[PDB]
A paper describes a structure:
Here, we elucidated the molecular mechanism underlying the function and regulation of P. fluorescens LapD, a transmembrane receptor essential for biofilm formation in this strain. As c-di-GMP levels change LapD switches between two states: the dinucleotide-unbound off state that retards stable biofilm formation by facilitating the secretion of the cell surface adhesin LapA, and the c-di-GMP-bound on state that supports cell adhesion by preventing the release of LapA from the outer membrane. Binding of c-di-GMP to the LapD EAL domain is relayed to the periplasmic output domain through an inside-out signaling mechanism that utilizes a juxtamembrane HAMP domain, a relay module often found in bacterial transmembrane receptors. Here, we present three crystal structures of LapD from P. fluorescens that provide models for the c-di-GMP-unbound cytoplasmic domain lacking only the HAMP domain, a c-di-GMP-bound EAL domain dimer, and the periplasmic domain.
The crystal structure of LapDEAL bound to c-di-GMP (residues 399–648; LapDEAL•c-di-GMP) was solved by molecular replacement using the EAL domain from apo-LapDdual as the search model. We obtained crystals in two independent conditions, yielding two different crystal forms (space group C2221, two molecules per asymmetric unit; and space group P6522, one molecule per asymmetric unit). While the majority of the crystal packing contacts were different, both crystal forms maintained a common dimer of EAL domains, and the resulting structures superimposed almost perfectly (rmsd of 0.6 Å over all atoms). c-di-GMP binding did not alter the overall conformation of the EAL domain observed in the apo-LapDdual structure (rmsd of 0.6 Å over all atoms), consistent with the lack of major conformational changes upon dinucleotide binding to the EAL domains of YkuI, TDB1265, and FimX. The most notable conformational change in LapDEAL upon c-di-GMP binding occurs in the switch loop. Dinucleotide binding and the absence of the S helix in the isolated EAL domain allow the loop to restructure, resulting in the switching of the conserved phenylalanine residue F566. In contrast, the switch loop adopts a conformation in the c-di-GMP-bound structure positioning F566 so that it can participate in homodimerization. The symmetric LapDEAL domain dimer is reminiscent of the oligomeric state in active EAL domain–containing phosphodiesterases, such as in P. aeruginosa SadR/RocR, Bacillus subtilis YkuI, Thiobacillus denitrificans TDB1265, and the BLUF domain–regulated photoreceptor BlrP1 from Klebsiella pneumoniae, where dimerization is involved in positioning an aspartate residue that in the active protein coordinates a cation for efficient catalysis. Most importantly, dimerization of the c-di-GMP-bound EAL domains is incompatible with the conformation observed in the crystals of apo-LapDdual.
Author numbering:
A (entry chain A), B (entry chain A): 400 to 648
The structure:
C-alpha cells in the first residue's frame, strides 16, 4: 500500500518533501569535531551539520537540500528550527558548538530579530555557541558590524567560514572580534604535495595573527595536510580525517 | 560631400571602423610614466597604451575598443601591430617600456610563435621591454611557465598587472621570475582615507618580497594614496597623479 518514487530534480517532490520536513521538525543534528592543529586530542568545538532524515529512512546532507530551501525561500525557516534545536540539545552537555546562519535570515530584519530574541532567551549558553557565515553569503560591512556587536552584547560569538577568496577584506575584519576564521579546504588540499599553496596560507596566518584572529583549516583529509597546517602555525583543523559527520556523542 | 554618423554601439560601424584601423595602421602609441614610490623623479618604465585616432580626428582609448576587438576576434591582430610599432619606436631612445599581450595571442600557438619570431628579431631591445598580462586573462600555469622561460631566453622580461583578486596563486609565481607585479588600483584607492585597506597591501608586499617580486601600484590619483604606498614600502607607482596618457616625450 506504500509506494515511493525517486525525487531526483523534481521541484514538486522537493517542495512537498521540504515543507513537510520543516513543518514536522524532521531535521536532525549531526556533528563534526573541530580540533587543535597542535594537539588533535584537544577539542575546540563541534560544528553542527543539518541532516534531513526522510520517511524512507535515508539521511540527506545539507549540501543536497540547502539549494532547494533557497529556491523556495525557506532558508530562514531552517535557521529558526536549527537554532532552537541546537539551544535545546546544549542543555544536555558542556561542549561548545558552532552553527551557520544564512543570508536569508541576516537580510530579513524581522527574522534576524527573532534570532536575537531566541538568543536573549538563552544568555546562559552564550559562551558555548558560535554563529558562522560562509564567505559566499557575507552581508555588507555595516550588517557584519551590527551583527557582531549584538551577538557580543548577548554573550555569543561570531565567525566566518570558507574564507580565502575575499582576503581583500582582511583589514575590514580588524574590529569585528570574530572568534576565528575557517579557511576553505581548497587552499590546504594536498598542501604537503603542492608547496606553491603554502605562501598564501603563510600570508593569511600572518595577517590574521596581527589582528588576533585564530585560523582553522577546513576539510582536512590527510595526515600530510595536517602536518603542514600544524607546522605553519594555524590554530585549528577540521575534516574527514577526524571522522565523518555523525549524531551526538 | 563628407558626412559622419555616430558609431555608438553599432556592431557594423565598429566592425568596419576597426578592420580599417587594423589594416591601415591607424593605432598610435600613448605613454604613461611608471615611477619609483620612494622617489617619483626616478622613472622605472613607460607603459604603452593603444590609441585609435579615427578619421574624424578623435582619439579612442583602448578601454573603449578592446572589447570590440575581442568580439570580432582581432585582439591578436592588435598585438602584432602594437608590438612591431613599439619595437620600432624604441630604436629612437633609451627608455624602458611595458606592453600588454592579450589571451587571444597567448592561446593561439601560431600567433604566440609569431610574437617570439618578432622578439628574436630584436634581441638587442630585450632589456628595455617588459610584456604584461592583466590578471583577467592569465593563461594556465604551464603556459605562464613556458611564456616566461622563452621570454627570459630571448632576453625580455614578463610581468602581471591588475593583480590582487588572485593572491591565492602568489606561491605559484615563485619561479616565474616576473619583473614586477602591478596591483589593481581598487586596492589602493583612497587608502590614506580607508585604513582597513592597508592590511591586505601589507600582506601582498610581505609575501611578494619573500619571493623577490617588486610591487607597483596602479591608478594612483592622490598625494595621500602615494604617501601610504611609499610608507608601506612598495616599489613603484603609476596613475593620473603623474599625468594623463600622452604621446611620446
Ligand atoms: N570533501 C570533504 N568534505 C568534507 C570533509 N569534512 C567535512 N566535509 C563536508 O563538508 C561539509 C562541512 O561542514 P561545513 O564546513 O560546516 O559546511 C556546511 C555548512 O556551511 C552548511 N550547513 C550545514 N548545516 C547547516 C544549517 O543547519 N544551517 C545552515 N544555514 N547551513 C548549514 O552546508 C555545509 C554542510 O554541507 P554538508 O552536506 O553537511 O557537508 C559537510 C561535510 O559533510 C572533508 O575532509 N572533505
Ligand atoms: N581612474 C583612473 N584611470 C587611470 C589612471 N591612470 C591611468 N588610467 C587609465 O587606466 C588605464 C591604465 O593603463 P593600463 O593599466 O596599462 O591598462 C590598460 C591595458 O591593460 C589595456 N591596453 C592598452 N593598450 C593595449 C594594447 O596595445 N594591447 C593590449 N592587449 N592591451 C592594451 O587596456 C588598459 C588601457 O585602457 P586605457 O583606455 O588606456 O586606460 C588607461 C588609462 O587611461 C588613474 O590614476 N585613474
Amino acid at each position: 500500500q506504500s509506494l515511493v518514487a525517486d525525487v531526483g530534480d523534481d521541484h514538486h517532490a522537493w517542495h512537498r518533501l521540504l515543507d513537510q520536513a520543516l513543518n514536522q521538525r524532521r531535521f536532525e543534528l549531526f556533528f563534526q569535531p573541530v580540533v587543535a592543529a597542535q594537539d588533535t586530542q584537544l577539542v575546540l568545538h563541534y560544528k553542527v551539520l543539518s541532516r534531513l532524515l526522510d520517511e524512507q529512512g535515508q539521511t540527506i546532507p545539507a549540501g543536497r537540500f540547502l539549494p532547494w530551501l533557497e529556491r523556495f525561500g525557506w532558508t530562514a525557516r531552517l535557521d529558526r528550527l536549527m537554532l532552537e534545536r541546537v539551544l535545546e540539545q546544549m542543555a544536555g552537555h558542556e561542549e561548545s558548538l558552532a552553527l551557520n546562519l544564512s543570508s536569508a535570515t541576516l537580510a530579513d530584519p524581522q527574522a534576524l530579530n527573532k534570532v536575537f530574541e531566541i538568543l536573549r532567551a538563552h544568555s546562559n549558553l552564550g559562551a558555548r555557541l558560535t554563529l558562522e557565515i560562509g564567505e559566499e553569503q557575507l552581508p555588507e560591512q555595516a550588517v557584519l558590524e551590527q551583527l557582531t556587536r549584538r551577538l557580543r552584547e548577548l554573550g555569543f560569538s561570531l565567525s566566518l567560514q570558507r574564507f580565502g577568496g575575499r582576503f581583500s577584506m582582511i583589514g575590514n575584519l580588524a574590529r569585528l572580534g570574530l572568534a576565528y576564521l575557517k579557511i576553505d579546504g581548497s587552499y590546504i588540499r594536498a598542501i604537503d604535495q603542492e608547496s606553491d599553496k603554502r605562501l598564501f596560507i603563510e600570508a593569511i596566518q600572518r595577517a590574521a595573527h596581527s589582528i588576533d584572529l585564530p585560523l582553522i583549516a577546513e576539510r582536512v583529509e590527510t595526515e600530510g595536510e595536517l602536518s603542514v597546517i600544524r607546522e605553519m602555525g594555524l590554530y585549528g583543523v577540521q575534516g574527514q580525517l577526524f571522522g565523518e559527520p555523525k549524531p551526538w556523542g
